[PDB]
Amino acid sequence: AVNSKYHHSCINCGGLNTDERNERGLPCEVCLPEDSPSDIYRALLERKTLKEYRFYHEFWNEYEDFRSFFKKKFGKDLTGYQRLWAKRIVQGKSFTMVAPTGVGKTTFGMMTALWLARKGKKSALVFPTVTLVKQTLERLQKLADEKVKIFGFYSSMKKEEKEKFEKSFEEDDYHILVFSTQFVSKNREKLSQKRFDFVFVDDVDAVLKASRNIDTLLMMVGIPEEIIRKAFSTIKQGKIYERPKNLKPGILVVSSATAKPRGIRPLLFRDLLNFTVGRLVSVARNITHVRISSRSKEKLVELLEIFRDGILIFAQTEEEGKELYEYLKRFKFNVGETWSEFEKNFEDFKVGKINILIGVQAYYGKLTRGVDLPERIKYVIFWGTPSMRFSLELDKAPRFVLARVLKEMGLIKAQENPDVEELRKIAKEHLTQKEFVEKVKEMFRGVVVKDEDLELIIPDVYTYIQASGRSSRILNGVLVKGVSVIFEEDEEIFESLKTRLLLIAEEEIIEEAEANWKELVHEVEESRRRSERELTDTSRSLLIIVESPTKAETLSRFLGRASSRKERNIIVHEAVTGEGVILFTATRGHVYDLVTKGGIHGVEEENGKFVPVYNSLKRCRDCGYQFTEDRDECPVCSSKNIDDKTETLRALREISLEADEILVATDPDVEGEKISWDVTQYLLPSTRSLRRIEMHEITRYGFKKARESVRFVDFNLVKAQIVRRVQDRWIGFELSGKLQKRFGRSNLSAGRVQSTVLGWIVEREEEYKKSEKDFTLLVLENGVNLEVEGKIADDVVTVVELQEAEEEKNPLPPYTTSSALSEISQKLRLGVQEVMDILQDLFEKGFITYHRTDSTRISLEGQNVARTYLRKIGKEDIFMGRSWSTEGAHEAIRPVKPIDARELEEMIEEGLIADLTKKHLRVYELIFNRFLASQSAAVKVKKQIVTVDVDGKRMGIEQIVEILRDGWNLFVPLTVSPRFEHRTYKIKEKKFYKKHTVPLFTQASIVEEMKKRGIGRPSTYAKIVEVLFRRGYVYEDKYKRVRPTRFGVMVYSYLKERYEKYVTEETTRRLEEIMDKVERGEEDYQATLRLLYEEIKSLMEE
């Protein structure tokens, strides 16, 4: 427990409670002075202070009642899906059923309607077919008790029962109504005037067929047509509609959408019932991808004798498809075809007659629209990578082919005017066929350019994935194991396919040699027979919490976001995986922060120790002002459009009641840990199952391996964060006020580091003029220019000493935050804050590792990434794996997927991936190259150290002349210089000036320095630098050099003349070091707090 207080943490009164009490699960001392009570509910009942815990107690009560009921009526207990479902149904939330078929959807609908009818509430069950009405009714009548009133309507209805139904429905007195969609579409107004408390839809597609049915259901749950028309108008407008808080709605449940939920009508559910009708898209796949070096049919047969039953073949075209058809039909295997008898052999294979079914790339990826049974297909064979081909001549080259060329050449920049004839003309005029193929193969990266057949090959990754997925699916709550074998002789196609497969599906392909066959087959058949056995349920619901929406957006992609619930201030997306359901939501920043209300600026002292007092943040969307105070209107713009984080907290606590285990996945640094604890402390009294995972990569591998290393909230990190925060608050406020005494402006001093840095710049403005010394440039004949002392007049250079050596050149270490923020803001004309934004963007999108790092460590994973890229590029021999530094928390900034920037641009042009801007791509190119250089072999060169004589003054200079063997120079350019002899050279033109020995500061220089002098940490640099500009203490110029303004110089001069002991570097580095010692648990928390308080106590009295 970190000794702190939180403003809106109490579970029962909602007021202020401490940290430890919420850590355990107890309300505040106002609600409950008892330290170790027997029961919270009972003890709060006896104190007459039970206010909000009643909701939780009765929640678990009613839920456990539901669970016992379902466990008694049905055979076994609720499953992992029905658990979340039940925990949602006792709250009265409307949602979408995200699950495969056969896990008890209809069953759960019936039992829910039965329980709710048992309580006294009336419900309705809508079905697509009348046969399902009859069946559901059948199952209900023989499981419902006599006290329940069940009625139904269908086409072939009994003579007296058909009118009995009408008479019953007319009475407005029922408990459960069961009918078709036809009934709803026909009896719109008849159903609109009734009011239910529960509605179940076993098929949402039939209902979504008409628009009037949506309004019908919304009128059935308890919403008037006027509010419906209003919301309809608002969503027609384009903006969302706030649901009236005074509205008490019913319960609507829909099965997963099979098609695409187009229309303006579905959004009504999103804005009124707080849920989206998401369609079931399951990326749940357990497929092993293996590739064979050639189209050797002998190997094919050899594998066919191992796989036996459960094989599927995909051939290039129907011609060669018929060729292989004939081949294996003549070798006497169980042959099949889907271009002639696509329906007969389908079911023949389905039963067990045919063992191997052969198809074509497009003939089966489109003509399996029936059922497509994945419990028979265990192995999918690809005879040639699924790809598209384009001829490159005069014509036949598509729009994009000429586009990418000419755009970089010089004709189509004119607002991108598309005209094929024109493309042909330009092709005739400027390019010859040779030059054309050259330029195309030069520009187009990531694809396969065949100059031989004049064909451009693009591996259809989508087709390969959709086809491969037919060997793996969630069958009876168990994800069977698939096997996909590719027969591709050309390494280029296989490599392209492998990269764009690693890009989307995040799946890899192994060579034939590194694959155990009998083992894999055994595992497949084992998964099959394990799926066949009686399903003892294992599915679970899972909750993941992130601090930024971007993260959740990029998680949804490789998780499989189907539906999206909107909970209060936040939006939580749900995805179906193999292990069960996974819920992920965004917090959008911090939740708690120190309040300036009372205490030492923000922290209250009691019993010697220090106690920070926090509160929920509110950011305005209009002006953008953030404040911790519990205001209704903004103190700046006086507008109500604020973003209260206590709403986010309450929402999260509501959601935590649904999930079984909850994981927090914030940033691996101290900030993310502080946030993680700020959340877990709030959720702890609710659900006692909270853990912490640290994702360094936002990918499948990153997520999974972050989960494999799951831990609890380390308190040292949190303590360090609190220490730094408190220091910033105290010192910042003190120096701010002391500056208010002298200049008048309110907010001035931001902290200590800011003062130190501004001091550096100010003193730099002085030590830049005095370091101005005379120099002259000397362009030498048949050599290079040479910079020397001011005034020379001998017009000759005499080489005195010359020696050559063969050194091996090692590359520069991988990008850390210092390296990146420096060299990227240098090579590009970008500010450090902007570069930091780009870095964070690349990280959260899942292209680079965690950017806030100060170590050069590289796991064998990243090394393997480098080696695999080099393997693709054809130059794997120049690879050298370097750990660089064993000690270090995070890996250095490196690309997570072996894909160069050009390949990425291609993937975006094609239409696969990104919302990536140009600067994003360039920065990624920078990191990619620096990293690969840091993972490539050393460069053998030959450098000479020449001591020349210019104007009677000996002067040495070392230079690289020749490159013996090329290594890492393929990524980072290594410059070579003309050789030097042991003779005398003539000076062509002397150029006299006086460039300063100590040049002025740049942003990259500032970062370089506060890294060098040990001031700050990766999560502060760009912030600290930007603070100077934002306050108005610093400006840039022609050379984009950092110069202090009049104001800044005045401020630092004043601070220097008065309070220097609190600004001096020797104290700043000391404090930073001590806090970093707190970060590891090597220095006391409360003690350092006491120190800060002491020096603050000293400073304040001036």
Catalytic residue among 174, 379, 850, 924: 850
- Using rule CB under 5 A, residue 636 touches Zn ion: yes
Measured distance CA(726)–CA(720) in Å, rounded:
10
Q: What is the three-class DSSP state of 1026? A: helix
In the block, residue with structure tokens 């004709």:
411
> What are the residues facing 540 on neighbouring strands?
580
Which amino acid belongs to residue 659? A
> What number of chain residues touch Mg ion (CB under 5 A)?
3
Instruction: Give the E-state strand segments of 904-982 in sequence order.
Output: 939-950, 953-965
From Zn ion, Mg ion, none, which one binds at residue 105 (CB under 5 to 8 Å depending on kind)?
Answer: Mg ion
> What number of chain residues touch Zn ion (CB under 5 A)?
12
Smallest distance from the beta carbon of 678 to Zn ion, in angstroms? 19
Check the annotation: does 103 bind a ligand. yes
With the CA atoms of 439, 441, 443 and 447 taken in that order, what torsion angle do they form, in degrees rounded to the nearest 10?
160
From Mg ion, Zn ion, none, which one binds at residue 634 (CB under 5 to 8 Å depending on kind)?
Answer: Zn ion
Smallest distance from the beta carbon of 5 to Zn ion, in angstroms? 12
The residue among 202 and 567 lying less far from Mg ion, judged by its C-beta, is 202
Give the torsion sign (CA, 568, 570, 575, 579). Answer: negative
Query: Which residue of 264, 623, 796, 914 would you call a contact of Zn ion, by CB under 5 A?
Result: 623
Cβ pair 179, 187 in contact under 8 A: no
- Using rule CB under 5 A, residue 840 touches Mg ion: no
- Using rule CB under 5 A, residue 181 touches Mg ion: no
- Using rule CB under 5 A, residue 9 touches Mg ion: no
Tell me the window of 102-110, 769-777, 796-804, 854-862 that interacts with Mg ion (CB under 5 A). 102-110
- Using rule CB under 5 A, residue 112 touches Mg ion: no
Give the torsion sign (CA, 686, 687, 688, 691). Answer: negative
Burial category of 1013 from C-beta neighbours within 10 Å (exposed 0-12, middle 13-18, buried 19 and up)? middle
Check the annotation: does 205 bind a ligand. no
Tell me the two tokens of residue 744: 């008048």
Query: Which residue of 2, 31, 304, 478 would you call a contact of Zn ion, by CB under 5 A?
Result: 31
From Mg ion, Zn ion, none, which one binds at residue 202 (CB under 5 to 8 Å depending on kind)?
Answer: Mg ion
- Using rule CB under 5 A, residue 631 touches Zn ion: no
- How many helices (H) and strands (E) in the chain? 38, 40
Which amino acid belongs to residue 600? I
Measured distance CA(1033)–CA(1056) in Å, rounded:
15
> What are the residues facing 151 on neighbouring strands?
177
Tell me the two tokens of residue 941: 């060169």
Check the annotation: does 107 bind a ligand. yes
Tell me the window of 97-105, 332-340, 669-677, 783-791 that interacts with Mg ion (CB under 5 A). 97-105
- Any idea how long the chain is? 1102
Smallest distance from the beta carbon of 685 to Zn ion, in angstroms? 11
- Residue 701 known to be catalytic: no
Smallest distance from the beta carbon of 766 to Zn ion, in angstroms? 42
Smallest distance from the beta carbon of 633 to Zn ion, in angstroms? 8
How many CA atoms within 13 Å lie on the side-chain side of 883? 6
- Using rule CB under 5 A, residue 202 touches Mg ion: yes
Binding mask 581-620 for Zn ion (x = CB under 5 A): ---------------------------------------x
Q: Are strands 561-567 and 570-576 parallel, antiparallel or unpaired?
A: antiparallel
Buried b / exposed e over 548-578, threshold 16 CB at 10 Å, is: bbbbbbbbbbbbbbbbbbbbebbbbbbbbbb
The residue among 255 and 338 lying less far from Mg ion, judged by its C-beta, is 255
Q: Residue with the closest Cβ to Mg ion?
A: 106
Residue 81 CA, distance from chain mean position = 25
The residue among 108 and 464 lying less far from Mg ion, judged by its C-beta, is 108
- Using rule CB under 5 A, residue 621 touches Zn ion: no
- Using rule CB under 5 A, residue 685 touches Zn ion: no
Residue 714 CA, distance from chain mean position = 24
From Zn ion, Mg ion, none, which one binds at residue 943 (CB under 5 to 8 Å depending on kind)?
Answer: none
The residue among 95 and 869 lying less far from Mg ion, judged by its C-beta, is 95
> What are the residues facing 1018 on neighbouring strands?
none
Check the annotation: does 170 bind a ligand. no
Instruction: Provide the H-helix boundaries in 772-884.
Output: 817-827, 832-844, 860-873
The terminus-to-terminus CA distance of the chain in angstroms comes to 37
Tell me the window of 200-208, 611-619, 697-705, 812-820 that interacts with Mg ion (CB under 5 A). 200-208
From Zn ion, Mg ion, none, which one binds at residue 860 (CB under 5 to 8 Å depending on kind)?
Answer: none
The residue among 309 and 647 lying less far from Zn ion, judged by its C-beta, is 647
| 108-111 CB contacts, 8 Å cutoff, 24+ apart | 108/82, 109/200, 109/202, 109/253, 110/136, 110/139, 110/140, 110/143, 111/69, 111/70, 111/73, 111/74
Judged by phi (left if over 0) then psi (alpha if -120 to 50, else beta), residue 230 lies in alpha
Query: Which residue of 106, 213, 686, 969 would you call a contact of Mg ion, by CB under 5 A?
Result: 106
For 205, residues 6+ apart whose C-beta sits below 8 A from its C-beta are 128, 257, 258, 259
Smallest distance from the beta carbon of 95 to Mg ion, in angstroms? 16
Tell me the window of 196-204, 477-485, 678-686, 702-710 that interacts with Mg ion (CB under 5 A). 196-204
The residue among 638 and 917 lying less far from Zn ion, judged by its C-beta, is 638
The residue among 256 and 1005 lying less far from Mg ion, judged by its C-beta, is 256
Buried b / exposed e over 236-250, threshold 16 CB at 10 Å, is: eeeeebebeeeeebb
Tell me the window of 61-69, 198-206, 762-770, 913-921 that interacts with Mg ion (CB under 5 A). 198-206
The residue among 107 and 716 lying less far from Mg ion, judged by its C-beta, is 107
Q: What is the three-class DSSP state of 1029? A: helix
- Using rule CB under 5 A, residue 105 touches Mg ion: yes
Measured distance CA(156)–CA(162) in Å, rounded:
9
The residue among 130 and 649 lying less far from Zn ion, judged by its C-beta, is 649
Which amino acid belongs to residue 264? I
Smallest distance from the beta carbon of 642 to Zn ion, in angstroms? 7
Angle, vertex CA 911, rays to CA 909 and CA 915, nearest 5: 80
Query: Which residue of 252, 303, 570, 634 would you call a contact of Zn ion, by CB under 5 A?
Result: 634
- Using rule CB under 5 A, residue 848 touches Zn ion: no
Give the torsion sign (CA, 276, 281, 286, 289). Answer: negative
Check the annotation: does 843 bind a ligand. no
Smallest distance from the beta carbon of 136 to Mg ion, in angstroms? 9
Check the annotation: does 599 bind a ligand. no
Measured distance CA(454)–CA(209) in Å, rounded:
48
Q: Are strands 176-180 and 150-153 parallel, antiparallel or unpaired?
A: parallel
- Using rule CB under 5 A, residue 454 touches Zn ion: no
Tell me the two tokens of residue 1006: 């500032």
Smallest distance from the beta carbon of 81 to Mg ion, in angstroms? 12
What percent of the residues of the chain are helix, what percent strand, and what percent coil, each to the nearest 5? 40, 20, 40
Query: Which residue of 13, 478, 555, 562 would you call a contact of Zn ion, by CB under 5 A?
Result: 13
From Mg ion, Zn ion, none, which one binds at residue 620 (CB under 5 to 8 Å depending on kind)?
Answer: Zn ion
The residue among 202 and 694 lying less far from Mg ion, judged by its C-beta, is 202
Check the annotation: does 82 bind a ligand. yes
From Zn ion, Mg ion, none, which one binds at residue 13 (CB under 5 to 8 Å depending on kind)?
Answer: Zn ion
Nearest to 223 by CA among 237, 238, 202, 244: 244
Q: Which residues of this protein are in contact with Zn ion, per CB under 5 A?
A: 10, 13, 27-28, 31, 620, 622-623, 625, 634, 636-637
Catalytic residues: 850
> Which residues line the annotated binding site?
10, 13, 28, 31, 74, 77, 82, 99-107, 547, 620, 623, 634, 637, 667
Q: Which residues of this protein are in contact with Mg ion, per CB under 5 A?
A: 105-106, 202
> Which residues line the annotated binding site for Mg(2+)?
547, 667
> Which residues line the annotated binding site for ADP?
74, 77, 82, 102, 104-107
> Which residues line the annotated binding site for Zn(2+)?
10, 13, 28, 31, 620, 623, 634, 637
> Which residues line the annotated binding site for ATP?
82, 99-106
